[PDB]
Amino acid sequence: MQIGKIIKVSGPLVMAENMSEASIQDMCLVGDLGVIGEIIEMRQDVASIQVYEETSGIGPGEPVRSTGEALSVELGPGIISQMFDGIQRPLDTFMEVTQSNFLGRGVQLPALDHEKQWWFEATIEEGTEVSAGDIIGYVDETKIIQHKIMVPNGIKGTVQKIESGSFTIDDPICVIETEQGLKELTMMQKWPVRRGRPIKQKLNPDVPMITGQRVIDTFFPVTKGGAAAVPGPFGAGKTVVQHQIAKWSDVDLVVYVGCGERGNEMTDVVNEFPELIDPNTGESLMERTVLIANTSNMPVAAREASIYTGITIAEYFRDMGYDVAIMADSTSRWAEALREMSGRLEEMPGDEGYPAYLGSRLAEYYERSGRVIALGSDQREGSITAISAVSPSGGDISEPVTQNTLRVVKVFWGLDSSLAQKRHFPSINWIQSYSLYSTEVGRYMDQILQQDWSDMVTEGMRILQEEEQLNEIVRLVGIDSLSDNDRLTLEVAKSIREDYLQQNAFDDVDTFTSREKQFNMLKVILTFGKEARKALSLGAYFNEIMEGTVAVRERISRSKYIPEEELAKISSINEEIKETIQLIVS
Amino acid sequence: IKEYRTIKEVVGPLMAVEKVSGVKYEELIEVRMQNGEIRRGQVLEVQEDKAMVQIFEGTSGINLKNSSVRFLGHPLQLGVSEDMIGRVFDGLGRPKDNGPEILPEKYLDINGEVINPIARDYPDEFIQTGISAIDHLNTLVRGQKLPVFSGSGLPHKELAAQIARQATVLDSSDDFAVVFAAIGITFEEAEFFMEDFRQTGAIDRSVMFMNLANDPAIERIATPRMALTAAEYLAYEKGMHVLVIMTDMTNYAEALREISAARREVPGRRGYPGYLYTNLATLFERAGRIRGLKGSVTQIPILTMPEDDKTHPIPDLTGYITEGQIILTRELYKSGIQPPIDVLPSLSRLKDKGTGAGKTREDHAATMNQLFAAYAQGKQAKELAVVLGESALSDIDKIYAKFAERFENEYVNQGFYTNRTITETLDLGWELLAMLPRTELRIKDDLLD
Amino acid sequence: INGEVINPIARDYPDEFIQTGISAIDHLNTLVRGQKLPVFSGSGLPHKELAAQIARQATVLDSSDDFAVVFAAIGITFEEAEFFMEDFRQTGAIDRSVMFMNLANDPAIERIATPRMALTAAEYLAYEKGMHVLVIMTDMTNYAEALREISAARREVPGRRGYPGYLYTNLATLFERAGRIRGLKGSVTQIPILTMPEDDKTHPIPDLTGYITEGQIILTRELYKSGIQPPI
């Protein structure tokens, strides 16, 4: 293994001769101290290296060692439950081993535990022809998730020796006969974070994700393989929404990525996330989460690589046949790292100092998400769903980062602190929000429920949009100038906001609403509407309809709290509506 | 086919090869990486025995000493054939559809050739788009360039697919083909196009060039040039009337801007290179007709407008090269108007040479201007009429604004799956006008037929 | 004096309320122990006064110890500095303080060193000696101006609005030297102070500071001229 020598040091930029055995983008251990650097350029045998940690105290003469690879992740058992930085340093191993609260220059630690014994259960048989993504056996890594060991990309051939037993992730568990002879496989593979893990095919992300959060699942849904953006205004309950999706969604794993956050904000996530309880098991959510945590203090390259490191891990589990959600907060800070990196490379800036390639990088990320047929003879499916927070200074959505994002994703959940001000939660602005998946989801939904769901959703939304119109008429001038049909409309609208859109995350039952419960609840809201219309045309007046329906609207208000094993007491409200309204027709 | 194993420098996505010979400016290259990977590139500069190349897929992972460069001896070319019809390609014209072939007749520079000014013929005859607000008030002629100006969140994608399906020449005896260039769009956007085109069988007469958002910038920049080169072949060697549709031209300019920055150029006006005007002119001038030839090329560049600003480099510069423009607005779109065409700021500079008796029908010119003026005063009859509301409604001015209401919802709001023959368009033209008294009017011989 | 970066999973959430004794902060924009909360002001505006007041008055509601104040003056006039050093001497706030004074006619590199010196002192007092340290720094705008000067001298190429690409990292590098740490008695709370060039909120200095710190306190001219003190 060949060793360069530093010939120049000037700020973050180091140059070393005798590097010809290395490659553009290789990661480096620079100097005596051995700090992390990336080769940016090569002229003959001279490498220019962008160094990620302070170069203070380094000068000509000292060694440089190429790692032999671009920035990569270790992928194998031990990865679930960890907290990493943007470049996969293990933040807990860091504390035990260095006995320190500080991240010291050029301390190197493997991302995963290489010493831990795991039980490997072999599922494949000797003689079997295999290639990238075939499953050879599995590890029960956590109480929840089964880690499937796949044949790495690049390998093809015949299983020669496989066997169950206790192994560390370094031990050869399997030998493949290839055309180049015998290759040993371990339970781990490395992958470069800027290269998307290959797939058999990309599919349309057409299955709706069940978040159990009524405003999302119903009016602004995201499909498994879709992507949503969320603005991040202070005081609008973003964290609580993030948590609800992280824990209620019907995905197998969450990858959470914190890009380059304020120290104390990042500390918050680090504390709160481990306390999320997994709904089906009672175990920590961490038993199926991988967290990346970066403070704005971290190296710019770790802040920049955060999302890639994130997505690559998500891809690895996708390949196993799983549904993964990747949560990036906030991609605005990620982009700030991009901007810095651009200035460091003495580049031409684009708009507002952002590199010319901002949009590209965003696209590259989002297009690495989606529903796919993974490699392997199984042709199994998996998917990655992106939920990305944005936090444009002062809230301004019209800036570069949010603009380019809405140019490539399909769902926008617009959190709004004025809704928060009004105690309306989740503070998703139902006028400004959208989901370009609504139609396709409507179709699935109508099919799976045997019901006119699309119709109900669009009626619901038509009612809310009517309310925006009416509201302006009332403000200027007169609530007592509106027809009975409009006063009725306002009450149905109020019922959609208060009884449906408003969900309390901290309540046993309201915390999560099933697809079937969502349907009965909206069916009862809309049929109060329909029965009252019928009664109004039959010559009953508004005030009288209100007056005589106190009890039954109360039942509508408490719908959200009916347990799932009792959806009959929701259906039955329809009978109570009809019977009450028809009675009033006299 | 030269191969050199003598790479001297890599800086970002640029490499210097040395001890090279017979290499030409802009020649395509292949980099054979030490690990077996192959990347395409282009020679940016050639000096003595050196060549500087740009690698499309970038230069990450490359080990200089063990990589090699094949110099191919030609620039970016398209391999043309009649078998392009019904096939899908990417931005460099590689098959994307898993189909068979194709063995090209020949290879052409995607830059093309500049037409001798005496050889060019003036744009001539009606193309039917099936879209009233274009076919009537903003008519499209064979050989024209009429862009769609738009904006993020706008259904210009949907409009694009519709014209592609509904564009026809009625009648003629000459073939009619569509080249469709998608530039930097998402996989889902693409899948939507390939899905619609096949559902309706528009594919059977379309050639499709699909450039994705995550494709390298150089492929974005090349995509329309591949498309126009296919267009011109079909038009000028096969005698077809060819309609070229490209979305989204805004994506294209970002890509220029991205290449310009990589190549260490000083930016021009508002971020973009001075030569954005020139570059675009290279594209839009590639439309028209040739004296002595039957075929034509017609262009509908589609673009989204940043900040929704018409004076921005991108639409502005497009403006001076093209011949009118179809605007789409948010006010109309939000009213569920499909397509949301605002006809007032919309214009076709060439209508006159593609309408009237023989081309469309005798009443075209007049009905257009009558429907237009009536929509003009009708909208003013509401702009100042929300100021002073309907507490008192005018008898003439409130029969005008009802026209301004119905125009949008019945005449323009036709639907994205609705092909309206010109015959139909004009019949609905008059049907709406009969809301006004005769004294508010085309001419005396109106009620004639 | 560069220090070392705090392991993100080593930090503790800031918990405890700091009585600054200034209604507008304490009630409406509460400073909390371990927070980074800066003051954005302008030339002519009395941030100086506000700074001295927070330093005299800041206390926790606990049983201690008292705050130790580490005060870093950065590129300020002799007048500014002489105000501080007399107030601290007058009140006896000095017996509780560590002062780093660096004036406008001081070499721009020393300007650059000043905050790094102060923070090194603060972390030592806090994380090795178990003290609760309150770090006040004026005027960060000056730190920035000094940055451009050295940067120009090293022949670097400026990013957004004339300032260096690396400005962000530099700034975070200062302001993230703060907070409570698990298992440690002491803590560092920062109140960086800065004048906004041409009162421009979007200027890189105030903009980037905002991305890094946990909020900000603004003084306006409309308030100051109207004799309001503190003009928050």
Alpha carbons B196 and B190: distance in angstroms, whole number:
10
For B343-379, give one letter per residue: b (16+ CB within 10 A) or e. Answer: beebbbebbebbbeeeebbbbbeebbebbeebbeebb
CB A185 within 8 A of CB A176: yes
CATH top class, domain A116-185: mainly beta
Interface touch A360/B11, C-beta < 8 Å: no
Three-state DSSP at B306 gives helix
A chain contacts of residue C182, beta-carbon cutoff 8 Å? 101
A chain contacts of residue B11, beta-carbon cutoff 8 Å? 40-41, 43
Rounded-to-5 percentages of helix, strand, coil across chain B: 35, 25, 40
Q: Going along B335-436, which residue ranges are E strands?
A: 341-348
Three-state DSSP at B185 gives strand
Q: Which amino acid is at B138?
A: N
Q: Write out residues 371-400 of A within 8 Å (CB-CB) of C.
A: 393-394
CB A319 within 8 A of CB A374: yes
A chain contacts of residue B186, beta-carbon cutoff 8 Å? 363, 366-367, 408
Residue of A308, A406, A407 whose CA lies nearest to B183:
A407
Alpha carbons C79 and C94: distance in angstroms, whole number:
18
CB A513 within 8 A of CB A521: yes
Ligand-binding annotation for A439, yes or no, is no
| Encoded tokens for B10 | 């890599």
Classify domain A436-586 by CATH number: 1.10.1140.10
Inform me whether the C-beta atom of residue A406 falls under 8 Å from chain B C-beta atoms.
yes
Inform me whether the C-beta atom of residue A104 falls under 8 Å from chain C C-beta atoms.
yes
- Catalogue the long-range contacts made by C93-98 (C-beta closer than 8 Å, 24 or more residues apart): C93/C55, C93/C56, C93/C69, C96/C66, C96/C67, C96/C68, C96/C69, C97/C55, C97/C68, C97/C69, C97/C70, C97/C71, C98/C68, C98/C69, C98/C70, C98/C71, C98/C122, C98/C125
Strands A156-162, A129-131: pairing is: antiparallel
CB C115 within 8 A of CB C74: yes
Identify the architecture of domain A72-115+186-435 in CATH. 3-Layer(aba) Sandwich (3.40)
Alpha carbons B19 and B5: distance in angstroms, whole number:
9
With 0-12 / 13-18 / 19 or more C-beta atoms within 10 angstroms meaning exposed / middle / buried, residue B275 is middle
Taking the CA of residue C130 and the nearest CA in chain A, the distance in Å comes to 15
Q: Least CA distance to B151: which residue of chain A?
A: A407
Alpha carbons A286 and A278: distance in angstroms, whole number:
8
Inform me whether the C-beta atom of residue C214 falls under 8 Å from chain A C-beta atoms.
yes
Strands A201-203, A370-373: pairing is: antiparallel
Write down the residue that tokens 């897929």 correspond to: B57
When CB atoms are compared, the residue of A105, A296, A341 closest to C212 is: A296
Alpha carbons A412 and A426: distance in angstroms, whole number:
14
CB C52 within 8 A of CB C69: no
Q: Residue B108: enclosing H or E segment and its boundaries?
A: strand B106-109
Residue of A406, A429, A438 whose CA lies nearest to A227:
A406
Alpha carbons C98 and C188: distance in angstroms, whole number:
14
B chain contacts of residue A434, beta-carbon cutoff 8 Å? 153
DSSP string covering A114-182, please? SS--EEEEE-S-TT-EEETT-EEEEEE-SSS-EEEEEPPTT-EEEEEEE--EEE-TTS--EEEEETTEE
Instruction: Give the rounded distance of the alpha carbon of A179 from its chain centre.
Output: 40
CB A464 within 8 A of CB A431: yes
What is residue B68's DSSP assignment?
A: E
Residue of B394, B393, B414, B412 whose CA lies nearest to B404:
B412
Q: Which residues contact C217 (CB under 8 A, 6 or more apart)?
A: C24, C25, C29, C37, C38, C39, C40, C232
Alpha carbons C89 and B351: distance in angstroms, whole number:
85
Could you tell me the residue ranges of all domains in chain B?
1-449
CB B302 within 8 A of CB B283: no
Residue spans of alpha helices (H) in B346-396: 364-387
Residue spans of alpha helices (H) in A349-421: 358-366, 400-405, 417-421
Q: Is B309 left (phi over 0), alpha (psi -120 to 50) or beta?
A: beta
Q: Write out residues 45-84 of A within 8 Å (CB-CB) of C.
A: 54, 56, 83
For A356, list phi and psi in degrees, rounded to 5.
Answer: -60, -30
What is residue A479's DSSP assignment?
A: G
Q: Residue A375: enclosing H or E segment and its boundaries?
A: none
Ligand-binding annotation for A402, yes or no, is no
Q: Which amino acid is at B424?
A: E
Alpha carbons C115 and C102: distance in angstroms, whole number:
10
- Omega into B363 within 30° of 0, i.e. cis? no
When CB atoms are compared, the residue of A44, A348, A408 closest to B8 is: A44
What is residue B168's DSSP assignment?
A: B
| Encoded tokens for B132 | 């009233």
Alpha carbons C144 and C195: distance in angstroms, whole number:
11
Examine chains A and C and say if they touch (3+ CB pairs below 8 A): yes
What is residue B419's DSSP assignment?
A: -
Sign of CA dihedral C156, C160, C162, C165: negative
Give the method of determination. X-ray
Report chain C's C-alpha Rg in angstroms: 17
Strands A189-192, A146-150: pairing is: unpaired
CB A433 within 8 A of CB A412: yes
Q: Least CA distance to A225: which residue of chain B?
A: B188
Ligand-binding annotation for A116, yes or no, is no
Inform me whether the C-beta atom of residue A102 falls under 8 Å from chain C C-beta atoms.
yes
Residue of A320, A309, A73, A314 whose CA lies nearest to A190:
A73
Alpha carbons A428 and A434: distance in angstroms, whole number:
10
From the candidates A21, A42, A66, which should be mutated to test the interface with B, based on the most B CB atoms within 10 A? A42
C-alpha distances out from residue C204 to A403, C179, C197, Å: 21, 24, 9
Ligand-binding annotation for A232, yes or no, is yes
To the nearest 10°, report the CA torsion of C116, C118, C122, C128.
70
Inform me whether the C-beta atom of residue C99 falls under 8 Å from chain A C-beta atoms.
no
Q: Which residues contact B310 (CB under 8 A, 6 or more apart)?
A: B149, B316, B319
Ligand-binding annotation for A237, yes or no, is yes
Classify domain B1-449 by CATH number: 3.40.50.12240
- Helices B187-200 and B156-166, interaxial angle, to 10°? 30
A chain contacts of residue C10, beta-carbon cutoff 8 Å? 95, 101-102
CA count, 13 A, side-chain hemisphere, A260: 30
Inform me whether the C-beta atom of residue C178 falls under 8 Å from chain A C-beta atoms.
yes
CB C203 within 8 A of CB C161: yes
What is residue B397's DSSP assignment?
A: H
Ligand-binding annotation for A220, yes or no, is no
Q: Which residues contact B264 (CB under 8 A, 6 or more apart)?
A: A348
Q: Least CA distance to B66: which residue of chain A?
A: A21
- Catalogue the long-range contacts made by B38-41 (C-beta closer than 8 Å, 24 or more residues apart): B40/B92, B41/B15, B41/B69
Q: Which residues pair with B235 in a beta bridge?
A: none
Interface touch A105/C4, C-beta < 8 Å: yes
Residue of A333, A334, A282 whose CA lies nearest to A311:
A334
Q: Least CA distance to C34: which residue of chain A?
A: A264
Q: Write out residues 430-449 of A within 8 Å (CB-CB) of B.
A: 434
Q: Which residues pair with C103 in a beta bridge?
A: C76
What is residue B352's DSSP assignment?
A: G
> What is the C-alpha end-to-end distance of chain A, expressed in Å?
95
C-alpha distances out from residue A505 to A162, A561, C101, Å: 48, 12, 51
Inform me whether the C-beta atom of residue C38 falls under 8 Å from chain A C-beta atoms.
no
Sign of CA dihedral C121, C126, C130, C131: positive
Inform me whether the C-beta atom of residue B334 falls under 8 Å from chain A C-beta atoms.
no
What is residue A265's DSSP assignment?
A: H
- Omega into B339 within 30° of 0, i.e. cis? yes
CB B238 within 8 A of CB B295: yes
Every domain range in chain A assigned CATH 2.40.50.100: 116-185
CB A89 within 8 A of CB C8: no
A chain contacts of residue B217, beta-carbon cutoff 8 Å? 357, 360
A chain contacts of residue B266, beta-carbon cutoff 8 Å? 348
Instruction: Give the rounded distance of the alpha carbon of A384 from its chain centre.
Output: 8
C chain contacts of residue A401, beta-carbon cutoff 8 Å? none
Alpha carbons A287 and B52: distance in angstroms, whole number:
51
CB C47 within 8 A of CB C139: yes
DSSP string covering A327-347, please? EEETHHHHHHHHHHHHHHTTP
CB A81 within 8 A of CB A93: no
Alpha carbons A210 and A288: distance in angstroms, whole number:
18
Residue of A386, A228, A222 whose CA lies nearest to A314:
A386
Q: Which residues contact A377 (CB under 8 A, 6 or more apart)?
A: A131, A134
Alpha carbons B5 and B68: distance in angstroms, whole number:
4
A chain contacts of residue C150, beta-carbon cutoff 8 Å? none
Chain breaks in chain B (C to N over 2.5 A) after: 441
C chain contacts of residue A295, beta-carbon cutoff 8 Å? 5-6, 8, 172, 176
| Encoded tokens for C62 | 């606990």
Alpha carbons B169 and B173: distance in angstroms, whole number:
9
Residue of B155, B139, B149 whose CA lies nearest to B335:
B155
DSSP string covering chain C, please? ----EEPTTTEE----BEE-S-HHHHTTS--BTT-B--EEE-TTSTHHHHHHHHHHH-EESSS--PPEEEEEEEEE-HHHHHHHHHHHHHHTGGGGEEEEEEETTS-HHHHHHHHHHHHHHHHIIIIIT--EEEEEEE-HHHHHHHHHHHHHHTT----GGGS-TTHHHHHHHHHTS-EEETT-S-EEEEEEEEEPGGG-TTSHHHHHHHHHSS--EE--HHHHHTT-SS--
When CB atoms are compared, the residue of B65, B213, B257 closest to A363 is: B213
Inform me whether the C-beta atom of residue C151 falls under 8 Å from chain A C-beta atoms.
no
CB A410 within 8 A of CB A227: yes
Q: Which amino acid is at A473?
A: I
Q: Which amino acid is at A390?
A: V
| Encoded tokens for A102 | 């500080």
Alpha carbons C132 and B414: distance in angstroms, whole number:
71
Q: Least CA distance to B195: which residue of chain A?
A: A204
Taking the CA of residue C119 and the nearest CA in chain A, the distance in Å comes to 15
C-alpha distances out from residue B373 to A27, B53, B122, Å: 68, 57, 29
Q: Which residues pair with C34 in a beta bridge?
A: none
Alpha carbons B261 and B14: distance in angstroms, whole number:
12
For B283-318, give one letter per residue: b (16+ CB within 10 A) or e. Answer: bbbbbbbbeeebbbbbbbbbbbbbebeeebbbbbbb
Three-state DSSP at B103 gives coil
Q: Least CA distance to A340: which residue of chain C?
A: C165
Ligand-binding annotation for A235, yes or no, is yes
Alpha carbons B427 and B408: distance in angstroms, whole number:
16
